[PDB]
Every structure is written in structure tokens, then in C-alpha cells.
Write a protein that binds this ligand. Sequence first.
Ligand SMILES: CC(=O)[C@H]1CC[C@H]2[C@@H]3CC[C@@H]4C[C@H](OS(N)(=O)=O)CC[C@]4(C)[C@H]3CC[C@]12C
Ligand SMILES: [Zn+2]
Length: 258
Amino acid sequence: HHWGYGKHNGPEHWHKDFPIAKGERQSPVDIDTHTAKYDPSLKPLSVSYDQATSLRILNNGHAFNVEFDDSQDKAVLKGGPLDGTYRLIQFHFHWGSLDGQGSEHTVDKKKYAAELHLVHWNTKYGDFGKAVQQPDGLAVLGIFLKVGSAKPGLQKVVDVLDSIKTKGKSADFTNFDPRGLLPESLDYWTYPGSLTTPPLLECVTWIVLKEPISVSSEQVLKFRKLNFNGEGEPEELMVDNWRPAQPLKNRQIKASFK
Ligand SMILES: CC(=O)[C@H]1CC[C@H]2[C@@H]3CC[C@@H]4C[C@H](OS(N)(=O)=O)CC[C@]4(C)[C@H]3CC[C@]12C
Ligand SMILES: [Zn+2]
């Protein structure tokens, strides 16, 4: 009886195995745009993905993960609210059963169709396993998806999903350029939070871009054809793999922009 997103094992149950679920810096949150304070001391984000080397794509039973070779200093996030350098390890998405839900963060209670998470670890902790034990261990770059025009840079991902339909399936996925998933603007909100799935560790500096990317209805429909279950198990479509907004508590959301 492992955690997931259903009625019996979903977000409202997670606290039993992971009591930090009710902690002081949980994610996601609602971003109230009028209360977020412009912080002129925040620096522009530096996203350096020119040398990113993707290796593989995996259905882990909760999402699909595009994993990168992080053996060298290549694909790095720095600047913004961050001290030091954070290395890209993987990205994944959260999405809905319908276009009207799917994002984890919300903006003035607006839910987007999906949300992309590019996950980076602080190089001062040597590897990602050690980094998640630290309050400044990870930086997750969150990007909203709305349904409209297709995102051409997403299509290589969409097309490989047929080969990883079920939990535990992986596929080689080299030479994928994550620059193709970024919006024009790097204006962002930022706050201290957590992983949004178990183990819910309070190790994330969140950086959520204001500008969504547009993806086509057909692109997101293909996400919704994946399965939470393993091959030969009862079919459970991989939809609504999002955690709802959690209490902000004693936190401030800061805006990089006026
Ligand atoms: C406990 C542990 O080993 C950590 C190290 C890296 C973490 C992973 C980093 C990448 C994503 C981040 C993701 O958090 S999120 N949704 O806020 O971006 C939770 C799942 C997973 C697989 C994480 C689960 C817990 C992992 C395996
Ligand atoms: Zn995520």
C-alpha cells in the first residue's frame, strides 16, 4: 500500500508515512500575485543548458522523468535567488485529467493544465542524495503549461511516451535539448519549499516562471495515455499526478519583476 494519487493513497494520506507533509515549508503553494513582493535585490536567472546531456526517460509509476548525465559541470542554474551553482539532474511534469487542472503551483488560484519541474542540485553537497538533506540542497525551476499552440521542443518527449507506457519502463533518450521547453521571459517568483511528492523533503528553493509555455491539446493528451500501473496490472491512467496547494505559513513569496 504505497503512496500515489488515488482516493486511498493520495495527498491527504501522505502524512501518515511522511509526517513532514504537515511541515513548515511544504510545496506547492498558491502564488498570490498582489502579496508577492518585488525584490530588487534578486538577480536575473542564469540558465545554462547549452551542454546538457540527456540519457534516458523513465516511467517511475508517478510521472515520467527525463534524466541527465550530471557527472560534469554542464547544465547549470545559478543567479536568481541562489548562492552558488546547481546542476540539472532531471525534469518531469505534473498534469490533469482535463485542461482545467494539473499544475501544482497556482497563480491567484488559477490552475494550469500542467507544470514542468527542472530539478537541480547544489554542487557544494557533492551529489543529489546528500543535497536533499540540506535546506538549500535543490533548486526546482517550475514552468506552467497552457493548452494552445504546440511546443515544437516538446514533441521528441511526447513521441517516446508510447515506449514507456507503464511503471518501470525506460527508454534511451539522448541529445534532448531542454532549452526548447523554456518560455521567452525568465521573470519568476521564488520561495523556500519542498519536494512535492514523498519524501516531501524541505530542501527546495522554488523558482516559478511567470510566463507559461503553450503546448497543444494533442501533446497533453499523449501525457494522459501513460499508466501509473506496471505492465500486466489493472490499467490506471496517469492523470492528476499533482499535489494541491499547501499552507504558506511563515513564508514570503518574492517576485523578480515589477
Ligand atoms: C530521497 C532521495 O534519494 C532523493 C534524491 C533525489 C530525489 C528526487 C529528485 C527528482 C524528483 C523531484 C520531485 O520533487 S518535485 N515534484 O518537487 O520536483 C520528487 C521526486 C524526485 C524523483 C525526487 C525523489 C527523492 C529523491 C530520489
Ligand atoms: Zn515535480
